[PDB]
Amino acid sequence: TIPHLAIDPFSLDFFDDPYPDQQTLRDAGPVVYLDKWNVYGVARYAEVHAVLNDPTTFCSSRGVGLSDFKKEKPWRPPSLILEADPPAHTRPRAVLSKVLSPATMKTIRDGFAAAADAKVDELLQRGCIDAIADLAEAYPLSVFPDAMGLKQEGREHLLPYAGLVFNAFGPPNELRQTAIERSAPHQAYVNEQCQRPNLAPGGFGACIHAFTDTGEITPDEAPLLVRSLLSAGLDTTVNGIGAAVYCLARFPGELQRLRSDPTLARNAFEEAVRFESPVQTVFRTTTREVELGGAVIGEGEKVLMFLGSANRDPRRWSDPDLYDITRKTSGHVGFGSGVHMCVGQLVARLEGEVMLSALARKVAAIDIDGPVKRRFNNTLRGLESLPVKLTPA
Ligand code: HEM
Ligand SMILES: O=C(O)c1ccc(C2CCCCC2)cc1
Ligand SMILES: [Cl-]
């Protein structure tokens, strides 16, 4: 009843061009079985949305990667938020929500915007830049570590640790094994920066530790919740902003619309998240036998959600393969959906908005002028190098 496919969604060929195989996954049926890894897959918007919004049946405490924490040891102690279910999930989630609150955004927005304008001004002086290293990476590295309260020394561990975290969600292929092989120095740095004395006053890290006396979290929970932000808070925005610049570089018509109305910056970034879906995949584990799309999935089965495919499903979207900065993007699953929906999305959207605003006001053209190189990761989709010439407005 359930179609079996040999597609490996974690193969380099798949990463290089996932869209044909993602259509094959969608059109094979609402639920597929991936013989390569012995997991169920759902690639249509409807089933992805349904799974995300049934956390009781499709739990996260057994891991949101391929590995089932009930069968294998997690590569690191489980996250108190991402890898927890209600009710254990609820209070750690509330703390991170209050830490990354609208009030916090108001306190940091002006500095985030000034740094975005400064970076674009700097880049325009060079003209020919690499939109990854020099922008998508450089800008978040210029605001997020400081907003965390991190010291200067050791920040070079942040992106490697994030690449490790996101490769570790995948199956035990070479990408994952190599990441874990090299993990020790990055884990050691990150774990140490999670301790309260190492997080500067007023930043996100210190705010988490200050929240340890309300009865929501205890002091021994704060370090791992800092770990959550050092895991998820940087590499995601790098690939989000990279996605948006890549979109504007490829669709000059949309850059021209953005220039004509910079208030479209926030939705242009939201559309980029839908269009590229920097986070491609997430797993759940069934806690019971469950019917999904006519298939009977047993208990303790891994279910792979194709967020990027759901965000290009023509059953949900009109012209899903077009980048449209005035599209009504509400409902895309690029940030997830339901109780685990990205708790840091206000930070993500703030960075993306102020960067696209800087580009909208200061840049007239973005032309690819060198070889584009893709970056391969079991969970993240993005580029390694994006040579562009920036023409000033
Ligand atoms: C474009 C940027 C980002 C994208 C595309 C993204 C994507 C996602 C997605 C899809 C989830 C759901 C995971 C699941 O359902 O299992 C998630 C959760 C999460 N994200 Fe984001 N994220 C981004 C930025 C950020 C930032 C900036 C932070 C922190 C500053 C952050 C922290 C988290 C955390 C802690 C969770 C777990 C929330 C929970 O389990 O309740 N993310 N993210
Ligand atoms: O350590 C954590 O708590 C943690 C780590 C990684 C993530 C990812 C964010 C982007 C979507 C996939 C999951 C979320 C939380
Ligand atoms: Cl770790």
Structure overview:
With 393 residues, this protein is an alpha+beta fold. The protein has one domain (1-393). It contains 16 helices and 13 strands. It has helices at residues 12-16, 19-28, 45-52, 90-99, 102-126, 132-148, 158-168, 174-181, 184-193, 204-210, 222-232, 235-250, 252-260, 265-276, 307-310, 345-362; strands at residues 4-5, 32-34, 39-42, 58-59, 128-130, 281-286, 290-292, 295-297, 302-306, 363-368, 373-376, 381-385, 387-392. Strands 1-2-3-9-6-4 form a six-stranded mixed beta sheet, with helices on both faces. A three-stranded antiparallel beta sheet has the order 5-13-10. Helix 14 (265-276) crosses helix 16. The longest helix is centred in the N-terminal third of the chain and has 25 residues, at 102-126. The protein is globular. The termini are far apart. It binds protoporphyrin IX containing FE (HEM), 4-cyclohexylbenzoic acid and chloride ion.
What binds here, in terms of ligands, is: protoporphyrin IX containing FE, 4-cyclohexylbenzoic acid, chloride ion
Largest sheet: 6 strands, mixed
What is the SS-derived class? alpha+beta
Quaternary structure classification: monomer
Q: Strand sequence of the main sheet, in spatial order?
A: 1-2-3-9-6-4
Percent in helix = 40-55%
What radius of gyration results from the CA coordinates?
20 Å
- Measured distance between first and last alpha carbons: 57 Å
Number of strands: 13
Give the number of helices: 16
Overall shape? globular
- Overall number of domains: 1
Proportion in β-strands: 5-15%
- Helix and strand pattern: EHHEEHEHHEHHHHHHHHHEEEEHHEEEE
GO molecular function: heme binding; iron ion binding; monooxygenase activity; oxidoreductase activity, acting on paired donors, with incorporation or reduction of molecular oxygen
Cofactor: heme
Pfam families: p450
Keywords: Heme, Iron, Metal-binding, Monooxygenase, Oxidoreductase
